[PDB]
């Protein structure tokens, strides 16, 4: 694999900048000699570069306080601020320039949130595909959450090989006139290297926001075991849903039946507008 996994930079209230980690690889490429480059949104960022690691993953440098470079892949806020991001969707761009192939290029998403933005996590698996085929209206129910202000935030616990094809599915599904609202694809820390996983996931996600905000409203899932991930992450009992292969969700908190088109018909009362 080759490709950056999308990434999620939130600013403090000191305006400080956090990142979830970076989980780029240059698969196709063929050590210790490459130097990459970073652009985000068409613009070079000087000063920053990263390392690559045998297997083609790829960190930051950072000294430490013994002086022993460390294999971060959190980049620093100084660094993170660097990339000078706007909110919501950048283009970012790692180079890899190697004596033996030229330079190389992948391309990838990062988003940047604020502390008091709000997430609604939905999974993939099962949530929007009917077993882990799409089930009806979740496009149309998603993208009216967007537009109430809400961030819509996938999860998958697939392959990192799949990846780039997972990206590929949510974004060419149209129901109706609705397509899929655009927003980052957490991957499981299973699925990829260390230089029920899921719960662990959305910890990092949360702890990337400060303790005292819990930044995901809602979330979307196929198994009761989703709901324990949400419920431990800060979720209330009421705004998860879980639905079964018969494209019927249950309200948790309520123990209430409701389909899609439903719960897009409540969706000032249960995604009340953030303007
Ligand atoms: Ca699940």
Not at 15 to 41: A, E
Request: aromatic letters at 10%; proline letters at 5%.
């Amino acid at each position: 694999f080759s490709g950056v996994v999308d990434i999620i930079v939130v600013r403090q209230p000191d305006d400080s900048l956090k990142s979830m980690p970076f989980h780029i690889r240059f698969g196709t490429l063929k050590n210790q000699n490459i130097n990459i480059q970073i652009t985000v949104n068409d613009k070079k960022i000087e000063d920053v570069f990263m390392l690559m690691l045998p297997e083609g993953a790829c960190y930051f440098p950072e000294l430490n306080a013994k002086n022993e470079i460390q294999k971060k892949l959190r980049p620093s806020s100084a660094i993170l601020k660097k990339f000078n991001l706007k909110n919501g969707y950048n283009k970012i761009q790692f180079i890899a320039e190697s004596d033996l192939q030229g330079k190389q290029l992948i391309e990838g998403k990062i988003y940047l949130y604020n502390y008091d933005t709000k997430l609604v996590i939905s999974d993939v698996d099962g949530t929007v595909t009917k077993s882990d085929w799409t089930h009806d209206d979740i496009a149309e129910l998603y993208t009216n959450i967007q537009k109430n202000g809400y961030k819509m935030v996938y999860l998958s616990s697939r392959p990192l090989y799949f990846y780039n094809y997972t990206q590929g599915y949510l974004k060419g599904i149209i129901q109706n006139g609705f397509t899929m609202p655009d927003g980052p694809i957490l991957l499981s820390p299973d699925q990829i290297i260390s230089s029920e996983f899921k719960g662990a996931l959305l910890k990092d996600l949360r702890r990337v926001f400060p303790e005292e905000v819990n930044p995901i409203f809602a979330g979307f899932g196929n198994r009761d075991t989703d709901a324990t991930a949400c419920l431990y992450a800060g979720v209330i009992i009421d705004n998860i849903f879980i639905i079964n292969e018969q494209s019927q969700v249950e309200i948790l908190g309520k123990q209430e039946k409701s389909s899609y088109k439903k719960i897009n018909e409540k969706i000032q009362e249960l995604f009340p507008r953030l303007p």
